[PDB]
Design a binder for these strands. Structure first.
Lengths: 113, 156, 174
RNA sequence: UUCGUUGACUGUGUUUACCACGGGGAAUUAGAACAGAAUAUCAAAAAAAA
RNA sequence: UGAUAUAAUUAUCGUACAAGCACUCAGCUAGUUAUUGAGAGACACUCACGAGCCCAAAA
RNA sequence: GGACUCCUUAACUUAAACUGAGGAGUCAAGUAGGUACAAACCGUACAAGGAUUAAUUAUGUCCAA
RNA sequence: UGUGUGAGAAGGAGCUAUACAGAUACAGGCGAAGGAGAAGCGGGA
RNA sequence: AUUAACAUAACAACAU
RNA sequence: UUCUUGGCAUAACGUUGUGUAGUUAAA
RNA sequence: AAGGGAUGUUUAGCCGGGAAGUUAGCGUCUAACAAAAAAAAAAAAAAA
RNA sequence: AGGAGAGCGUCUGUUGUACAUCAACACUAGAUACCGCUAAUACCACUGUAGAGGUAUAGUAUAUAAUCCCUGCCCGGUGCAGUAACAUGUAAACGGCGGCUGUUGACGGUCCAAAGGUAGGAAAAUCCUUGUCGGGUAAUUAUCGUCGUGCGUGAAAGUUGGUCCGACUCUUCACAUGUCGUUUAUCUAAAACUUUUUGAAAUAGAAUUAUCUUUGAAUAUGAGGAUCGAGAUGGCCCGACGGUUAGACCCUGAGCACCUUUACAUCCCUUAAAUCAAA
RNA sequence: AUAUAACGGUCGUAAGGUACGCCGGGGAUAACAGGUCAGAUAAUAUUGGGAGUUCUAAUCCUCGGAUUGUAUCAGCACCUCCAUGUCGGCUCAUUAC
RNA sequence: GUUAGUAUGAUCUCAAAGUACCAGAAGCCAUGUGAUCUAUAUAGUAUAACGGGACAUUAGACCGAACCUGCGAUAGAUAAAUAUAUCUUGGAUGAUUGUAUAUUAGCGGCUAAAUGUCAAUCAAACAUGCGAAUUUUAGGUUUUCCAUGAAAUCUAUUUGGAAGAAGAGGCUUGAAAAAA
RNA sequence: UUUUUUU
RNA sequence: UUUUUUUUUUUUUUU
RNA sequence: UUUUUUUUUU
């Protein structure tokens, strides 16, 4: 494993184009905001990139299988399903990965959602 | 176990691909006389001539943008831009009609049905595809819905 | 008694060896991207008190580039040439841009190891030793016509100038 | 000069150094072409009552 | 009478040789099979048709 | 993931048929000949097959021969 | 046209997974100059 | 009635 | 005919998977 | 969530007979073979 | 299977073993813990039976070993008992109990701890396979007595032991004696030989089966040299790594099979918790 | 966003004994007997030094090297393969100095 | 006057096949039998034997016959016997001996406690199995002739040892027939 | 079927 | 002085 | 019902 003490920062575009960059800095400069002028393909122009102040029970294979088999603690999965549903997804038209929740017989034909 | 996953493979493997048909084979068939150019050629004639076994829809594609010498009015479900341009340059025609799984069977094998079915309405995807091909320049034949007419009356 | 077992003792040993040295001989056709000489940036202590030859690196000559690890790589389609430096007592690799053609026995003299005093002299010699100028050219002696070999991952052993194969023009040479 | 800058950019392509394979990854070219947005440096100033 | 000659089998770097089986004979006994596979720089036969080939189960 | 010998060389008691490296031959998978007696050394125009024939090789020439 | 190559529980005092948003990348530009003497400030652009 | 292993007998031999 | 550039690392980042993130107005 | 009794299964490096100590990615230090390596057989000069 | 000294020690009774050739179990006795009746405990078809057609001088569980003998200190510690709704009491239940330094040394300094081996025995069922001295013998290191340092054991963990007792080790005394230096004579026979009757097994690659020496790291009736004149029966057991099958050690086993503070996973039971009977 | 540092990566923080030892295939009982090796060491002779102190060799102690040999100790391989402290005694024997 | 594929018949078993060249362990699970030998005190439904002596004296007392049992030595160990033969073995009024018919069954029972015993090699009994048994060890593997002709090397496997498995490397390329 | 020993 | 050596399988050393 | 169906074409 790596023993690097360097902090991980996250630069976001000022254009609200959902563009982000990845870099590193020293740990001493904790209270220092990084600002650069990088290329933004979302607008085909040079825009500002500012450092963002980016900040849970993890689900494993074992846990998943247990849940799926026994049926205990299904709310963890149901929350993800609700999130997905809320977000643009499960659309009938213009969708191949997950056009529908399940088939008529109650099956998930798309292996990769 | 070393190379990562590749969903793109098995996602596109389950796609329903239309049956391709090169224009050179059609030209050879016309020269041999298997197909009659005096009338409009259709999938019924194409299947009965043993040219291409039609199962879900014939598609036309050209190679090296070769021009078409003859002039014909073919009826297929889809065609490439090069084929459309080559056929239209001489004065040919490409007609597209909407047919579902049942209707295609009915049309290709009318003898199999005591009472012929009724044409079904298209969905959003098929309507978009038909309108897209109309811009390409294929004569589309299908019933239009009310929501499109209403919207277009104002859009124009 | 006692004995400390070193970390590098058997079976835990270095399997990959530092194959440092020249990789192309004289009168050897090369193209850009091929590594001519491999080197390492690591330097040991007391370099001036050793017998081994690998502790000494070569300097760049003509039509060469230095990589990140101080490797000498070619930059043009040509033959490899070696030269010695009197001022420094160090060999220098030189590349002469040449087209693909039959190598005659009367042109071997062009690729001889000579001694120099200066880089300027190096170039001056290079110029004289060069077959022909790009802008003037010459008459090729039995140039290739067949396409190149297949990719490595396809076939490790490919026939050169296959009669069976058709004739293809050469454009990469120039 | 106590000088500028963020290029530590974004896309198309399957040709190449080494080679059991894997990790082109002790770390190789302008694949010299094509489609966008940035930074740095300009060049020239001959003829003096024979 | 003259000359000449280290039973056989398997393993093994090693005829390895003072290791393992066998008194002899009679009968039995160890690479069987593509309605489903094939030519992949350590080796791949042949017949028919041809941009066309085969036709499954009823019969 | 090899047994003997030739040159170089690590370890050992300049020990041991040990343990382990660099590059040539032989055996392994080689016949018959020489070396007194049991693979490794020398020689071979080196064993498809048959017969009552001639030869410079290691090497020999008092007797067993 | 003459180079690569550390095997054996052999020797040695090998050994540390780390740094940087920049007088640590960095165009252009600049950059250390004997001895003696003064100063007692571990200073090149 | 019947192969081999196995058991017994007869004949055949002289440069000894 | 264009005067430069896709860092720094003589110790270079743990592959794959999970999780997270990202993509689908098409035949 | 705690206790008692049963069932099942695991406990792998390497020198070394065994035990113990030591060690495990990558990188890296220590090397001996000869004379057509000698104008030292075959070369040069000959006023040959 | 006798006389005498001394070590150990409840046998009678059951049985072949927890190491170095020298054991265990059971028991007369005492003591601790649980339990008030549909008792506890056991089998584990659960409104059952045993316990028991019994009732705290009863039933059951654990450990020790004589009728007696005076029988040491310690609850920091797992567990149980109790409840400030986590003081305190149980060592005859549950592992055990120590360093420097100064004057042969009562005594003085200092560290640590819950406590800091008690007494007795003591060259030992324990250290060491020759500790000093005394008794026996022509010699005693074997053995008894004794000293208590050389290492050390250690009290209802069972220590020590008066008297009595002995299929338990050892020392020593007495009678006869072929055990003996060292071997004889007679007889018998489920001993041995001949004949009659009758008739096996282990083994066996083949065979017409050599003495000396030297080759082959194992090894010579079979290989080089020398030498050498055959067979059958009784007898012996020096070789042919003699034959058969008693014992016994190791592994690359990615092989079982048992036991177990592998308590990692699972099951059963007891706490806890829920449900119906139930107005 | 944790592990795989056993870092060609299943570590899943899941350990020991068997003298009650059965089955399978190999030859090793915790000084690794024999053969081979000859470090220590043994035999003969030699040299330096110290005793005998009149005296270097009547005689004795010790050191270096060389030849021969291997009793005993250590080490011990790829070779060999019976059962033990790698024998104690009894009977009966052969060879060399 | 420029595409070359598709489907049969042979051979073979190369990561195919509810068998995969053949033979060959310990052992697990399921369903049954066994208390006629042996252990538990023969548990009253039944039940037998013990001659004598010492002024031992109602007792774990002593000698001793029957009865139970069998120390040591010898022989046998292919047996007169798969635990026998001789002699002064020990107990013998008591946890004495002996008997008809009965109970406890293996994921077990018995056990005055040895891993001793349950139908003469039980740290987990015996019988049957279309539950048709597994092996990096190891044995065997059957007619001839001809052509060609190896390795004991490398990475990886926490890397082994008596070459296990996977990859790479190693083979048919060339030649070598002649007169002014 | 032995050789050597200057002047 | 030389021919005669590990000829160390035996005889022989005939020079 | 399965497979195949030139990338060349004055």
């Amino acid at each position: 494993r790596s023993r690097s003490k360097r902090l991980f920062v996250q630069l976001k575009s000022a254009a609200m184009t959902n563009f982000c960059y990845v870099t590193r800095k020293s740990p001493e400069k904790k209270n220092f905001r990084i600002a650069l002028r990088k290329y933004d393909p979302g607008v085909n122009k040079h825009v500002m990139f500012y450092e963002a102040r980016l900040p849970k029970k993890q689900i494993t294979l074992s846990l998943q299988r247990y849940i799926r088999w026994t049926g205990k603690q299904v709310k963890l999965l149901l929350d993800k399903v609700e999130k997905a549903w809320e977000y643009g997804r499960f659309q009938k038209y213009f969708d191949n990965q997950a056009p529908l929740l399940t088939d008529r017989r109650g099956r998930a034909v798309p292996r990769y959602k | 176990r070393r190379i990562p996953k590749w969903p793109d493979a098995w996602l596109a493997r389950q796609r329903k691909v239309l049956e391709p048909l090169n224009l050179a084979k059609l030209r050879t068939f016309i020269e041999s006389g298997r197909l009659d150019t005096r009338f409009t050629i259709t999938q019924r004639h194409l299947n009965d001539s043993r040219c291409v076994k039609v199962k879900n829809g014939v598609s036309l594609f050209n190679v090296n943008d070769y021009p078409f010498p003859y002039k014909i009015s073919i009826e297929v479900a889809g065609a490439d831009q090069s084929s459309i341009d080559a056929i239209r340059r001489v004065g040919g025609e490409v007609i597209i009609v909407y047919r579902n799984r049942l209707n295609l069977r009915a049309h290709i094998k009318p003898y199999k049905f005591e009472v012929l079915p009724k044409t079904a309405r298209p969905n959003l995807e098929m309507v978009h595809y038909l309108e897209k091909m109309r811009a390409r320049g294929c004569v589309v034949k299908y019933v239009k819905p009310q929501w499109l007419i209403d919207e277009e009356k104002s859009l124009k | 008694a006692s004995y400390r077992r070193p970390s590098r003792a058997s079976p835990t040993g270095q399997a990959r060896k530092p194959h440092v040295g020249v990789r192309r001989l004289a009168a050897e056709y090369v193209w850009p991207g091929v590594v001519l000489v491999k080197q390492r940036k690591v330097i040991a202590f007391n370099v001036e008190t050793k017998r081994r030859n690998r502790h000494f690196k070569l300097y760049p000559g003509e039509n060469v580039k230095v990589s990140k690890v101080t490797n000498l790589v070619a930059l043009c389609h040509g033959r490899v040439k070696f030269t010695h430096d009197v001022s420094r007592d160090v060999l220098v690799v030189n590349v002469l841009p040449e087209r693909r053609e039959e190598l005659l026995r009367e042109d071997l003299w062009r690729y001889r190891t000579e001694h120099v005093r200066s880089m300027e002299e190096n170039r001056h010699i290079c110029f004289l030793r060069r077959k022909a100028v790009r802008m003037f050219g010459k008459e090729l002696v039995n140039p290739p016509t067949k396409p190149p070999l297949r990719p490595f991952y396809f076939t490790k052993y490919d026939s050169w100038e296959n009669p069976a194969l058709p004739d293809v023009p050469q454009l990469d040479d120039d």
